[PDB]
mmCIF file of C-alpha atoms and ligand atoms in Angstrom:
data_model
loop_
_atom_site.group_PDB
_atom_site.id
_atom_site.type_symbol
_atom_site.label_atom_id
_atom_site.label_comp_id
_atom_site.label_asym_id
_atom_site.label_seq_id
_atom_site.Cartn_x
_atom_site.Cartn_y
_atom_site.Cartn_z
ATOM 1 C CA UNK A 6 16.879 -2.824 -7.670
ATOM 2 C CA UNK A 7 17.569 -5.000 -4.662
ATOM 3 C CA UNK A 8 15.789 -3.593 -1.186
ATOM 4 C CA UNK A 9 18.605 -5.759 1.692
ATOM 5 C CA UNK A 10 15.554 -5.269 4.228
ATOM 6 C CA UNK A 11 12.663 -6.058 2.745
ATOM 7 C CA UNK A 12 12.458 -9.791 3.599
ATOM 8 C CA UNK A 13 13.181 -9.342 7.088
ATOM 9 C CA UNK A 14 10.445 -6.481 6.961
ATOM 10 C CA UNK A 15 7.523 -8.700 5.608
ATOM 11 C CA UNK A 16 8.512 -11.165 8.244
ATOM 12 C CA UNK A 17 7.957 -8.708 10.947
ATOM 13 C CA UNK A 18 4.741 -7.994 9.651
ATOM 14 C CA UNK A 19 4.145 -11.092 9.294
ATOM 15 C CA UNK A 20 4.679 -11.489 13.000
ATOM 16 C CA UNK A 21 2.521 -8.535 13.763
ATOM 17 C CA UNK A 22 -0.173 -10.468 11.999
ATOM 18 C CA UNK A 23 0.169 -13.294 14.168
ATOM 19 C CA UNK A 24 0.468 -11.686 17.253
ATOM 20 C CA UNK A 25 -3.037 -9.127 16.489
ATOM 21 C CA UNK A 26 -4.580 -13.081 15.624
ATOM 22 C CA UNK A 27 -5.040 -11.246 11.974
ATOM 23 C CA UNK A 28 -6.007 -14.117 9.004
ATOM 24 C CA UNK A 29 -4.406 -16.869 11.518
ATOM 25 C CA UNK A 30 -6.048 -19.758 9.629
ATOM 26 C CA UNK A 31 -4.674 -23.267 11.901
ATOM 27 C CA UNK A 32 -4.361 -23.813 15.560
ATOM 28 C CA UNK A 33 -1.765 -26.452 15.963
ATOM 29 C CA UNK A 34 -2.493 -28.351 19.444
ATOM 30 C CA UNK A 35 0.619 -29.939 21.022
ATOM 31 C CA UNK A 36 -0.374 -31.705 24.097
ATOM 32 C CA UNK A 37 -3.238 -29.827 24.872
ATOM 33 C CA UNK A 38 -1.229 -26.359 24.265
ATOM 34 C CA UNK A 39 -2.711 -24.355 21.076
ATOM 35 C CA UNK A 40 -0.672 -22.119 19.037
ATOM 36 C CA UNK A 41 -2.349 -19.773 16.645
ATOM 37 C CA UNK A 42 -0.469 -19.456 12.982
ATOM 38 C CA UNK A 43 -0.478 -18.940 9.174
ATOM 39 C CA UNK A 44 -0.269 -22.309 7.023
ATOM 40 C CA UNK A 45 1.606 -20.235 4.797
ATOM 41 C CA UNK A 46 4.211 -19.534 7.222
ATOM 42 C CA UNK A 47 4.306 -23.256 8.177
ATOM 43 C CA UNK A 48 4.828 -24.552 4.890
ATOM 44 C CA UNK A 49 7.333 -21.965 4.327
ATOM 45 C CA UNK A 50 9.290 -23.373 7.374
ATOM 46 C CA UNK A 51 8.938 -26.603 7.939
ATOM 47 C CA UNK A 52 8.604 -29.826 5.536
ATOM 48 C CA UNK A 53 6.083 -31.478 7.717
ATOM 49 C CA UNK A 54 3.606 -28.929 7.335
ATOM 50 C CA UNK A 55 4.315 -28.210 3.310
ATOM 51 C CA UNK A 56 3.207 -32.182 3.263
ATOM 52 C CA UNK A 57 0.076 -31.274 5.987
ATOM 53 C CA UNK A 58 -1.505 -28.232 4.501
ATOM 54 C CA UNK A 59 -1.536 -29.831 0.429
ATOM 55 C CA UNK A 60 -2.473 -33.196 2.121
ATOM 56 C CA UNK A 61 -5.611 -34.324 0.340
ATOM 57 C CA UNK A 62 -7.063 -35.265 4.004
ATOM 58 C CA UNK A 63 -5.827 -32.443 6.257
ATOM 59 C CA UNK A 64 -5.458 -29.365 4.106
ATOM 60 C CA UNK A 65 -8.945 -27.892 5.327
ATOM 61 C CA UNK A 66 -8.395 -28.320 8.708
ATOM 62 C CA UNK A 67 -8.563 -25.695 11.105
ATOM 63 C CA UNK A 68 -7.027 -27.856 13.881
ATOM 64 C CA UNK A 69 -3.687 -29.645 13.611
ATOM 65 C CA UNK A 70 -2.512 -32.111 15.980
ATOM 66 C CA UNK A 71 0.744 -33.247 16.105
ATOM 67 C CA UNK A 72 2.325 -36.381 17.333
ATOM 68 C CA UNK A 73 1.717 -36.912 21.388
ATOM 69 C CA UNK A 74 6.014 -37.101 22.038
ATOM 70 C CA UNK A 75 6.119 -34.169 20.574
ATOM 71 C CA UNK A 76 7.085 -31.232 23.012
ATOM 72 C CA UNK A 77 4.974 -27.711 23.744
ATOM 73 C CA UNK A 78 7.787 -25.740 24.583
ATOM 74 C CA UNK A 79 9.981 -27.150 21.533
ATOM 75 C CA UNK A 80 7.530 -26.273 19.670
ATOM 76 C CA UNK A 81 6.947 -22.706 20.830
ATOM 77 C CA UNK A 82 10.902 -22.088 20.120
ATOM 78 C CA UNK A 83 10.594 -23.454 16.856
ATOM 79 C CA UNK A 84 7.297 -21.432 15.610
ATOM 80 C CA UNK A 85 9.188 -17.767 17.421
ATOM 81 C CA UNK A 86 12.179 -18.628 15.269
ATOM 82 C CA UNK A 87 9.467 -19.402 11.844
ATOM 83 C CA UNK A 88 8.099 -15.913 12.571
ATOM 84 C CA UNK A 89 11.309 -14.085 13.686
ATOM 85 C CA UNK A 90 14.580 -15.877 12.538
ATOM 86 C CA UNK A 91 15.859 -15.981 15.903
ATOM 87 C CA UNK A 92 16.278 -19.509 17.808
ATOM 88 C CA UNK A 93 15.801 -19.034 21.512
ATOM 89 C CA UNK A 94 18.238 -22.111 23.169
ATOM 90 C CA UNK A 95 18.895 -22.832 26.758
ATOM 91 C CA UNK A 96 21.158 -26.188 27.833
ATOM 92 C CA UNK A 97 17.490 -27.635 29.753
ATOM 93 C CA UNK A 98 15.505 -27.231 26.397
ATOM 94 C CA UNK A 99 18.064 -28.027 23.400
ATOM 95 C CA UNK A 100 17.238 -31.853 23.013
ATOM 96 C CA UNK A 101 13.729 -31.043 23.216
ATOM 97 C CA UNK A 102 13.831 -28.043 20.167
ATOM 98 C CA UNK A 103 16.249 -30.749 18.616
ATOM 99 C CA UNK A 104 13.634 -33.349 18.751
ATOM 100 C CA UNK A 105 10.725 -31.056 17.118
ATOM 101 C CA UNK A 106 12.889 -29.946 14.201
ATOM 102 C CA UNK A 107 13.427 -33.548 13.495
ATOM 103 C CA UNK A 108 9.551 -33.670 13.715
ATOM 104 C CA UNK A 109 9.204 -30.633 11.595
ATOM 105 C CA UNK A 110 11.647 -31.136 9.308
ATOM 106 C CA UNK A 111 13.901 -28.254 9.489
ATOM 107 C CA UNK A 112 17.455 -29.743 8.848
ATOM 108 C CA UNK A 113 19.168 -26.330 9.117
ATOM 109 C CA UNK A 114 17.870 -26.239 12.770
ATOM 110 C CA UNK A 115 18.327 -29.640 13.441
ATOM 111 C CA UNK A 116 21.860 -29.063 12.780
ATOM 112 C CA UNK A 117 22.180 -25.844 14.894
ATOM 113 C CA UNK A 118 21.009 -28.268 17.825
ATOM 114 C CA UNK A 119 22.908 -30.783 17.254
ATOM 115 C CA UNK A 120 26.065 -28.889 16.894
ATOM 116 C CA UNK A 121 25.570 -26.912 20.099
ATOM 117 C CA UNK A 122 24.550 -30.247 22.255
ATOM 118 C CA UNK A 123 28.271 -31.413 21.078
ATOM 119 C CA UNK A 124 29.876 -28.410 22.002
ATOM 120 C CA UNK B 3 18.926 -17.582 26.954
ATOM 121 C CA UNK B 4 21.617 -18.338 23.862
ATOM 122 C CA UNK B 5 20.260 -16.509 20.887
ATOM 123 C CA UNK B 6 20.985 -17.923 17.333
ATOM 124 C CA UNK B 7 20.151 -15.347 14.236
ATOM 125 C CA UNK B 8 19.556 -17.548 11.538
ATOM 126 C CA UNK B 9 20.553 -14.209 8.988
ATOM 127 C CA UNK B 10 19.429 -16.260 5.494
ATOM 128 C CA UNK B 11 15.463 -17.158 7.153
ATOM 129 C CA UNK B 12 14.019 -14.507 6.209
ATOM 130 C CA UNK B 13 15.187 -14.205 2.371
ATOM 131 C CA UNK B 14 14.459 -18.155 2.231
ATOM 132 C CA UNK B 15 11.052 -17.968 4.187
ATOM 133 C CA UNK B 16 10.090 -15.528 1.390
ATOM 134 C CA UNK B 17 11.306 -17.512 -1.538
ATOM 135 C CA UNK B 18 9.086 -20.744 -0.344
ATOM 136 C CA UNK B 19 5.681 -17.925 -0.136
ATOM 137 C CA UNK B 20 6.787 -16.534 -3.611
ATOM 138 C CA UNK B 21 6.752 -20.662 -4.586
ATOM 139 C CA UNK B 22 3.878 -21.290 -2.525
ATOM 140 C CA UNK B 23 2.097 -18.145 -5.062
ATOM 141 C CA UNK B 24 3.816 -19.729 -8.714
ATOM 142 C CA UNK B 25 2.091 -23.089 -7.342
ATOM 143 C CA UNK B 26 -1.163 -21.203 -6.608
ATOM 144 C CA UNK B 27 -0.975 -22.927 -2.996
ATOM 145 C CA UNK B 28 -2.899 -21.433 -0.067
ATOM 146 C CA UNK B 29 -3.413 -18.372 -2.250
ATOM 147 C CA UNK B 30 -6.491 -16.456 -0.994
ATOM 148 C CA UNK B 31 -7.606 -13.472 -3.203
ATOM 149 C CA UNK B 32 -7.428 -12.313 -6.658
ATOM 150 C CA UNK B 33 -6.329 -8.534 -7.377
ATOM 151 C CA UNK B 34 -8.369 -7.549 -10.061
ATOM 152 C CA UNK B 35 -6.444 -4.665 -12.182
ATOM 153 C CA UNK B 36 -8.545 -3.455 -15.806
ATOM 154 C CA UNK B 37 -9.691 -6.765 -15.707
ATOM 155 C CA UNK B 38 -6.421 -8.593 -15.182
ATOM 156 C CA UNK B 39 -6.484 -11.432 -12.346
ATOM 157 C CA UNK B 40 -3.622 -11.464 -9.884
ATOM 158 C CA UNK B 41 -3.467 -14.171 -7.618
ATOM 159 C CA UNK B 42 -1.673 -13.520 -3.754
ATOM 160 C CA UNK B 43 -1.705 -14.317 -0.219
ATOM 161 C CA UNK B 44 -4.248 -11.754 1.982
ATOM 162 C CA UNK B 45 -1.047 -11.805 4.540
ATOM 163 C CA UNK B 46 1.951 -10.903 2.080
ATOM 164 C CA UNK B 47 -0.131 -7.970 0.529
ATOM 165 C CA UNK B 48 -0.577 -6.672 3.968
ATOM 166 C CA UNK B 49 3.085 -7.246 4.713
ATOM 167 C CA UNK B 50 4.319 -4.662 1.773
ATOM 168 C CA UNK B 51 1.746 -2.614 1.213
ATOM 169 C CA UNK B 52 -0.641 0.118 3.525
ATOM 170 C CA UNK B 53 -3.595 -0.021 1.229
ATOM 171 C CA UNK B 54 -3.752 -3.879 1.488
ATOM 172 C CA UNK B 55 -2.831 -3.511 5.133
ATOM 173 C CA UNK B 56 -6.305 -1.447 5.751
ATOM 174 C CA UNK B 57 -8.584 -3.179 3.406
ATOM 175 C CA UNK B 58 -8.043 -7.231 5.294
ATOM 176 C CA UNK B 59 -7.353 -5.604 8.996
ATOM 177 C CA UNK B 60 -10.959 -3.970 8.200
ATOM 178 C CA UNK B 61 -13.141 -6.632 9.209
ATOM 179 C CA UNK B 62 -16.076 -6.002 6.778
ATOM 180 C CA UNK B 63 -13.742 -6.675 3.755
ATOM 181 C CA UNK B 64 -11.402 -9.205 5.847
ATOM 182 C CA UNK B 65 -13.296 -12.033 3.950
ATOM 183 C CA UNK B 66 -13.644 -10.822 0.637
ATOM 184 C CA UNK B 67 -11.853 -13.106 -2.057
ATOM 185 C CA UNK B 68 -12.221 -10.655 -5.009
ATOM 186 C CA UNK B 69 -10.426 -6.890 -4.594
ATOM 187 C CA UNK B 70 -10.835 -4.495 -7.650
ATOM 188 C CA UNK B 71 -8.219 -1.597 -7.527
ATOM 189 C CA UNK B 72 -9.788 1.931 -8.626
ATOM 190 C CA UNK B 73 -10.010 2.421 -12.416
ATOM 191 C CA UNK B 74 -6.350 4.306 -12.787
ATOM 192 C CA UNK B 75 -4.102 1.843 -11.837
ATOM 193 C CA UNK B 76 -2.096 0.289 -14.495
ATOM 194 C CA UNK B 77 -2.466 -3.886 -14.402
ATOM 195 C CA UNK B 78 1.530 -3.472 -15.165
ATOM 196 C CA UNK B 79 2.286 -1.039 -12.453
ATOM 197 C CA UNK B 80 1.003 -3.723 -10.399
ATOM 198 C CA UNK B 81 2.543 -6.786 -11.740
ATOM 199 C CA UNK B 82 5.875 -4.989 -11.207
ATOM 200 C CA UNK B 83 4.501 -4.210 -7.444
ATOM 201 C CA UNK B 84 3.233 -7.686 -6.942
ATOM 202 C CA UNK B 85 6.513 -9.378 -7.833
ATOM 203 C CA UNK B 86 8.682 -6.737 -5.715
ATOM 204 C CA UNK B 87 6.296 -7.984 -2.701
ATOM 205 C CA UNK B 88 7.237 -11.450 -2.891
ATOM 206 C CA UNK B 89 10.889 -11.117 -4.389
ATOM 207 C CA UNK B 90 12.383 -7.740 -2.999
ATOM 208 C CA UNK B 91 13.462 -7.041 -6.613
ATOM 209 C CA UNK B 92 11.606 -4.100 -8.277
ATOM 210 C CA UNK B 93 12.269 -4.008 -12.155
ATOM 211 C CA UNK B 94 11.584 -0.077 -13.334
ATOM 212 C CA UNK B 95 12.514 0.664 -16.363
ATOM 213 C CA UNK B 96 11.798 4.255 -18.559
ATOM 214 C CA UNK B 97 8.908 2.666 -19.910
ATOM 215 C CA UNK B 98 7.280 1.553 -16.696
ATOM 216 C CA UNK B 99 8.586 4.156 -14.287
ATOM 217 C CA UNK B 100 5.076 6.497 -14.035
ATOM 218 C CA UNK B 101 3.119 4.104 -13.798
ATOM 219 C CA UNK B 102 5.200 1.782 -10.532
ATOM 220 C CA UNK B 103 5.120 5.325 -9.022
ATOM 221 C CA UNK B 104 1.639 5.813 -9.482
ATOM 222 C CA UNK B 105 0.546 2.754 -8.019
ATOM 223 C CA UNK B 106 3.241 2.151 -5.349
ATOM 224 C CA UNK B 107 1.396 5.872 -3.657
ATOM 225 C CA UNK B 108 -1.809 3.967 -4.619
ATOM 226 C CA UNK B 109 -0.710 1.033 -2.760
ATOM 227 C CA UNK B 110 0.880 3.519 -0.113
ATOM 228 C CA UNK B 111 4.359 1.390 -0.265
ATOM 229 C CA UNK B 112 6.074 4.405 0.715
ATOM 230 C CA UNK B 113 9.738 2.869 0.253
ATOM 231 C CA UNK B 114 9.249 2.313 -3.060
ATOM 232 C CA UNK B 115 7.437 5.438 -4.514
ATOM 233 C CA UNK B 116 11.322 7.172 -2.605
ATOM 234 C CA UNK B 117 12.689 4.313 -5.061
ATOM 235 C CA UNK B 118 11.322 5.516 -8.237
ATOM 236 C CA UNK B 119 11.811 9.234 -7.362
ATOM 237 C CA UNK B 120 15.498 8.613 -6.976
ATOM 238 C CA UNK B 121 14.717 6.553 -10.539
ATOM 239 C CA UNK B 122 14.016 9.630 -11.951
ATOM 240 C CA UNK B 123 16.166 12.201 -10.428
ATOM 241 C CA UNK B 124 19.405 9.798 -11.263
HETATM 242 C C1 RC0 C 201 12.153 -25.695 -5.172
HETATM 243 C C2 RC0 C 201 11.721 -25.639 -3.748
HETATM 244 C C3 RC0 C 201 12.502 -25.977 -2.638
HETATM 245 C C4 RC0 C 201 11.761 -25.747 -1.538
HETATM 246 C C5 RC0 C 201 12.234 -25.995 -0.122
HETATM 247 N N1 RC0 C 201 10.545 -25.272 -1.960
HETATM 248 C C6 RC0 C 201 9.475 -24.856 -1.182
HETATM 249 N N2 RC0 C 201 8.563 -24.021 -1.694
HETATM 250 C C7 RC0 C 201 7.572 -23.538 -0.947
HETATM 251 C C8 RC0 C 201 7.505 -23.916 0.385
HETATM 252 CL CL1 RC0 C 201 6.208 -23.310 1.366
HETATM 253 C C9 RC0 C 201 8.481 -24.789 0.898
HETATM 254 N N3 RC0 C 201 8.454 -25.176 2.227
HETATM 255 C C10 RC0 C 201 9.316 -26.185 2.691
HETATM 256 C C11 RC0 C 201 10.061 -25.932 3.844
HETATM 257 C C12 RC0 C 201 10.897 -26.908 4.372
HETATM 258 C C13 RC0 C 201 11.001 -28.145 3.745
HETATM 259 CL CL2 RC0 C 201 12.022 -29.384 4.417
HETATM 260 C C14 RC0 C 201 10.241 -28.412 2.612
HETATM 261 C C15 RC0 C 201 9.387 -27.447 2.093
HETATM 262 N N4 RC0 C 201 9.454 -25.197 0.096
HETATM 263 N N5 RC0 C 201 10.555 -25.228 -3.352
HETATM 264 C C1 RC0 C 202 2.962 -1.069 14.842
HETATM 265 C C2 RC0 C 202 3.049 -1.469 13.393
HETATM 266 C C3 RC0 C 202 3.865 -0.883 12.415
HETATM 267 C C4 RC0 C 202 3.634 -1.513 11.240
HETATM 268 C C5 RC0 C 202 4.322 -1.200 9.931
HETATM 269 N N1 RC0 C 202 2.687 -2.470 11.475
HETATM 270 C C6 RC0 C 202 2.185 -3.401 10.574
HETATM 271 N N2 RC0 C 202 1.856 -4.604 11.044
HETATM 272 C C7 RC0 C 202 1.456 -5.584 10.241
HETATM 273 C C8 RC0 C 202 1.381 -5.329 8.888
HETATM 274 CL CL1 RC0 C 202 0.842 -6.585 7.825
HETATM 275 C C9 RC0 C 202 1.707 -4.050 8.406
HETATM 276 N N3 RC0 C 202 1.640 -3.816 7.040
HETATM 277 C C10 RC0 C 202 1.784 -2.509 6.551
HETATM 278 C C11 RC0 C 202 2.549 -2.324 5.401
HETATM 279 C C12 RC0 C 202 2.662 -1.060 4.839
HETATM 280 C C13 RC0 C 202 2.019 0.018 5.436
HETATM 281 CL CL2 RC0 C 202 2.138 1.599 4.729
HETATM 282 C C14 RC0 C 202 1.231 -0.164 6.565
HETATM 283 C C15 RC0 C 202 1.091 -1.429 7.109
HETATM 284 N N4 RC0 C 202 2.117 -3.124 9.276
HETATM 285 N N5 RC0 C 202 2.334 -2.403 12.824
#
């Protein structure tokens, strides 16, 4: 028996979670700006943070910091979308979600971007 | 602000945590059913299930690493529960059927105990 709605239900909770700051177990600092989340969820998403949280140096770290170029903003967009499946775009911010996705690896996105910036 | 729904993410963001769990990555307690070991994530057992839900929200248990479940339930009943959580795929079969029901109330996964009661009444 297949239940259609149960994946989108567990990420809602999922959600929940993070926004109650339940079992959040990284901060991820992006110039300066800290943003509260599951490593699971990370991984899940994103290819740079599979290879961060089973790095032999950086898997116990409660703190994350990524890359100084690397954009706040983008990177809020990009963690709302992990958590809800929805990316948030406007014409001012597009290169700069573009840009983290790169960062994050998260070709699907990546492509979104890029095929929006060209239309 | 243009609004992309990315309809696949949430099926695929589920697939990598039910990888993450074969791989024993980031996995943070072990169910403990009649002495059978299940291994999970706190966070996806509080996704699915109300039981789970009130045990890690409650902040004297929050950091336990060990959970036994009561004496009754079935270390099957669970397996089939556990892999519904991370799969959205519940196998009941004749065989198995009381004892899902039994501990999907248990696990108060509401959805699912309707699931088996239609089971039975088809
Ligand atoms: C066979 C297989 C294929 C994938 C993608 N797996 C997997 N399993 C678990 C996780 Cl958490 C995860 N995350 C993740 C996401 C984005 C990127 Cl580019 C890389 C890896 N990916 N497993
Ligand atoms: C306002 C609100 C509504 C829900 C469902 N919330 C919620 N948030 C987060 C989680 Cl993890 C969670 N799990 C969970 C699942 C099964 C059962 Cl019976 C009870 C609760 N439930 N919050």
């Amino acid at each position: 028996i297949q239940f259609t709605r149960h994946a989108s239900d567990v990420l809602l909770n999922l959600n929940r979670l993070r926004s109650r700051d339940i079992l959040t177990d990284v901060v991820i600092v992006v110039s300066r700006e800290q943003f509260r989340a599951h490593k699971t969820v990370l991984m899940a998403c994103s290819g740079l943070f599979y290879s961060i949280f089973t790095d032999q140096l950086k898997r116990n770290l409660s703190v994350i910091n990524l890359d100084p170029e690397i954009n706040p903003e983008g990177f809020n967009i990009l963690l709302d979308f992990m958590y809800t499946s929805r990316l948030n775009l406007r014409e001012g911010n597009i290169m700069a979600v573009m840009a983290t996705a790169m960062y994050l690896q998260m070709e699907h996105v990546v492509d979104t971007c890029r095929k929006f910036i060209k239309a």
